[PDB]
């Protein structure tokens, strides 16, 4: 969809007599985009020369070509977008120096735009360096540095070049921070023997980068510390979801490949056994238990009050729309709160798929309804989180996920729309992404009516409604 910049320049000067057809030719660049690699110093000089001297926003593009090209240049189609943006800055810097020499729009001038762009690149390069080395604490300090850079780049946040870079860095920082879940931060002194087994297996399989010591901790703990293993082990519904952890417990090694054709006891999914040896707050670390509750394959005398109590606590603590705006540091805290309950992006997807399987007593049916609301609200949260950035790019992706209920679930359209009909989305989607009229009118001080029509048109093609 990206234009051939040089071909667009050739068509531009051949049609420079008709300002209308020259406006339609340059609109292919504004609607689509130009590759940042195609914006060389020589190409900028000819693009300005090919533009009509007056008419529509051609005067704005001529006077402020740096802002205009930055607002339509793309870097995401490059192997390294940050290095591509740096070279884009060099070409725009060569153009300004090799062609030196009105105060209408101060933020949109060439000198103000280019130095603000390099200011962003320097922060992003230092942030990219810190995250690459780590492949008050560093996590909070990089989050603060990025959000300050995004705040200072507010007048340019709608520029495709800086919007893509902020989008690239935010998603990269979010992905890195969501891996920093060490087991020792979530260990409770009240954790039982089954709690510890499921917790260690959870963090070693989902966060091995920061839990490399769990392999020897699990081996030492299982061999020398557990004493009630034969109680919560059996040799039943939901047992197929416990087979991997049951084998590693039976062998005493988290790194053991699934046997050589060996039979072993499975961690019990019996409700009365789980009521004794599992803390109710760790229920979502027990997939076999959640399996039985979702499928309602349970007897009338199984006591489920402890797990219904936990579901109510989760519903009251996390499932409502907050009043204030939730910024990047708030979203990171919520992940750690959800990880504490056993919810990450992967386990929410598996539980959301597990809940689609259709199943009796009303009290068992109510817990399934509570689980579905919890699982699908946190599933939606992790889908928006991994594509979050305070830019129009995330706003579009957010609408596709909420309005269309896009996901990766398996099933016919009938059972897919059936499970979403039994879900009321009140989860925190109040993510920080706002460019309002106060922001707009502050940056368009001396904008003429022809310049304002172009700016409104560019914002509409990126945001849609506002």
Residues 6 or more apart in contact with residue 374 via CB below 8 angstroms: 311, 314, 315, 319
Backbone phi and psi for residue 326, each to the nearest 5 degrees, phi listed first: -100, 110
Contact of 398 with 367, CB cutoff 8 Å: no
Q: Is 5 buried (19+), middle (13-18) or exposed (0-12) by CB count in 10 A?
A: buried
Half-sphere exposure in the Cβ direction for 138 (13 Å, CA): 13
CB 299, CB 264: distance < 8 Å:
no
Alpha carbons 314 and 301: distance in angstroms, whole number: 25
Q: Where are the domains positioned within the chain?
A: 5-177+439-463, 181-284, 304-433
Breaks (C-N over 2.5 A) in the chain follow: 101, 135, 235, 359
Q: What is the CA angle 256-259-265, rounded to 5?
A: 100
| Angstrom distance (rounded) from CA 138 to CA 177 | 10
CA dihedral 193, 194, 195, 198 (to 10 degrees): 130
The whole-angstrom distance between residue 122's C-alpha and the CA centroid of its chain comes to: 23
Q: CA–CA separation, 395 vs 295, rounded Å? A: 36
Q: Residue 316's closest CA among 401, 373, 381? A: 373
Q: How many CA atoms lie within 13 A of 334 on its CB side?
A: 24
With a CB cutoff of 8 Å and minimum separation 6, the contacts of 249 are: 197, 201, 222, 229, 233, 267
Q: How many CA within 13 A on the CB side of residue 53?
A: 0
What are the b/e assignments for 140-162, b being 16+ CB within 10 Å?
eebbebbbebbeebebbbbbbbb
* Distance, first Cα to last Cα, the chain: 25
Q: Report how this structure was experimentally obtained.
A: X-ray
Contact 35, 69 (CB under 8 A): no
Of 53, 7, 14, 58, nearest to 28 by C-alpha is: 7
Q: Which two tokens stand for residue 270?
A: 């019996």
DSSP string for 204-242: HHH-TTS-TTHHHHHHHHHHHT---TTTSB---TTGGGS
Distance CA 161, CA 145 (A): 19
Place of tokens 């292919």: 28
Would you mind telling me the total number of residues written for the chain in this entry?
A: 466
């Amino acid at each position: 969809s990206t234009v051939d910049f040089k071909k667009l320049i050739e068509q531009l000067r051949a049609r420079a007599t008709d300002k209308a057809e020259a406006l339609n030719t340059v609109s292919q660049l504004e609607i689509g985009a130009v590759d940042a690699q195609d914006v060389t110093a020589s190409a900028v000089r000819a693009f300005v020369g090919a533009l009509p001297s007056s008419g529509y926003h051609f005067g704005f593009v001529r006077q402020n070509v740096v802002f205009y090209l930055l607002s339509h240049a793309t870097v995401q189609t490059a192997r390294d977008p940050l290095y591509a943006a740096e070279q884009l800055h060099e070409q725009l810097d060569r153009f300004l120096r090799h062609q030196h020499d009105e105060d209408r729009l101060p933020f949109y001038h060439n000198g103000a735009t280019l130095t603000a762009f390099q200011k962003l690149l320097q922060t992003l390069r230092e942030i990219q360096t810190v995250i690459a080395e780590q492949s008050q604490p560093l996590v909070r300090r990089v989050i603060t540095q990025l959000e300050t850079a995004a705040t200072e780049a507010r007048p340019y946040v709608n520029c495709r070049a800086v919007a893509e870079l902020l989008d690239l860095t935010y998603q990269r920082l979010i992905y890195w921070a969501c891996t920093l879940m060490p087991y020792v931060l979530f260990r409770r002194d009240t954790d039982t023997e089954l709690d510890t087994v499921l917790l260690m297996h959870f963090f070693y399989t989902h966060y091995r980068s920061v839990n490399g010591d769990l392999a020897v901790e699990f081996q030492n703990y299982v061999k020398n510390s557990v004493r009630h293993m034969s109680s919560f082990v059996s040799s039943s519904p939901g047992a197929e979801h416990m087979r991997d952890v049951s084998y590693k417990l039976f062998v005493g090694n988290l790194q053991a490949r699934d046997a050589s054709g060996l039979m072993f006891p499975i961690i019990s999914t019996r409700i009365s056994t789980v009521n004794l040896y599992l803390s109710p707050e760790r229920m979502f670390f027990h997939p076999g238990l959640i399996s039985r509750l979702l499928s309602e394959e349970v007897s009338p005398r199984a006591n489920l009050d402890a797990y219904a109590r936990v579901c109510d606590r989760v519903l009251e603590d996390h499932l409502h729309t907050p009043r204030r705006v939730q910024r990047l540091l708030d979203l990171t805290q919520m992940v750690m709160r959800l990880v504490e309950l056993g919810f990450n992006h992967d386990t929410c997807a598996a539980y959301a798929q597990m809940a689609l399987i259709q199943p009796s007593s009303l009290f068992v049916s109510e817990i399934r309804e509570k689980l579905i609301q919890i699982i699908y609200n946190f599933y939606t949260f992790f889908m928006c989180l991994y594509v979050y950035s305070p830019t129009f790019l995330f706003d579009h992706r957010r609408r596709l996920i909420l309005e269309q209920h896009r996901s990766t679930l398996i099933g016919s359209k009938e059972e897919l729309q059936h499970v979403w009909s039994n879900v009321t989305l009140n989860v925190n989607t109040h993510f920080a992404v706002q460019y309002t009229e106060e922001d707009f009118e502050a940056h368009t001080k001396g904008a003429t009516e022809a310049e304002r029509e172009y700016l409104y048109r560019d914002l509409h093609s990126k945001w849609g409604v506002h």
